[PDB]
Amino acid sequence: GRDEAGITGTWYNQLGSTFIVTAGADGALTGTYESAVGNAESRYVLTGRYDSAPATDGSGTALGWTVAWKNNYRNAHSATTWSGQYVGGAEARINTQWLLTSGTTEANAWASTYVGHDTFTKVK
Amino acid sequence: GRDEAGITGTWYNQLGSTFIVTAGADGALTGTYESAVGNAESRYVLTGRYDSAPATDGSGTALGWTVAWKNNYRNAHSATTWSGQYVGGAEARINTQWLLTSGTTEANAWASTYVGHDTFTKVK
Amino acid sequence: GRDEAGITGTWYNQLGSTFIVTAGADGALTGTYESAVGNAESRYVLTGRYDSAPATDGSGTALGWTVAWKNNYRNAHSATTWSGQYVGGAEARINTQWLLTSGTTEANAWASTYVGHDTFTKVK
Amino acid sequence: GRDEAGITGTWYNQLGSTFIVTAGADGALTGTYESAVGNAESRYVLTGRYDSAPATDGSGTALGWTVAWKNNYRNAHSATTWSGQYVGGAEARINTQWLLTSGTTEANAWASTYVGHDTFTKVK
């Protein structure tokens, strides 16, 4: 995977959350997520995918992953998906936008989904 | 998993795309996706997560998954994440919103990401 | 405005909300919105814009509008923007996606914004 | 309007775009937008709304506005809506997320809408 090495490891977003990921040669992303905010404690499983053969023209690397907010400690009856791109070089970034959907009744379905943006760095 | 049985199987969206998924007792989603539209052909790997112990109050089941649009045939240098909820009963649905991010240059990053909504049914 | 006539009037979404709009020759949208759901009662002012000279190739007509959820009855300390396109012909539609932002503290800013989709018709 | 004074004036986002707005005592936003990127040149009309009586608890002020990307120079057959909140004090900000919809054919409607985020400051 072209950015397998670049992506694999520990990442931190602007909220102080921690994303620990392994990138597989096959396009797999596996790891754990720890949210500094919301109805969350400790680590949650994540899985996702990335483009293991990106464009050679200085474009970033498309990727995404999911966390369901259930672990042994808590269940927030919700899942977040991050969609974004990895940008390599001296100050590597993963720039994402995310959708957080809660399980709701049909009456409340219109308010099921939050949208936001997280920027992940290798430091802080 | 409460909706493991409900979720596992073949789903169809309003665009004529096909989503084939296995739900694991542990919250895993694994399978393949075939898009009726865009820079896509044949099946792509998907992975994701779902709430294996949802609320008992008639709420839906939160879930999400990712496809990176690389397979043996094509590479669209992009990934989609679907975030939504499974709603059980006679006419079972998965109601999603999705983010599609393309790898871009930093100049074009502002236009990296599409947002849309897909509704999945067990028929048609 | 090419679709001035097409757009002007009363529209209904899938939630039973009512959107009453005048399209101006200059691209203006003005009117009122009444939400069937959420922290809302009676009519709220809306303003927005539309493409008064759309493509002639069967493309829809881009448009958007805002409601701030303050009127004489209530203040939900929030605003929704609908972004979408008007599609003309026998069963005219306005197909939208929307962002609802609440005023929050900086601590809660990550959860400030909902995303959804509304489809508006001239009947029901 | 509590933040009428705070909001009215010239704002700059991270892309180098310029947003010139007047906030009305009644919740109105009117002005012009000049995009540093995309199929845009010179100024475009904007209109929108803001919460003229926000919470007193340190919450931001909800607001939104629309630009249709037609002016005397160009027509990009598209509209953007920004949804966000104004945050007052020494380093005032407008933190937004936006939807950009293009007029499309029904075949291409699934790819009609971009999502992004802009942060506006009074300097740079």
Ligand SMILES: [C-]#N
């Ligand atoms: C690409 N439009």
Ligand SMILES: [C-]#N
């Ligand atoms: C507010 N939940």
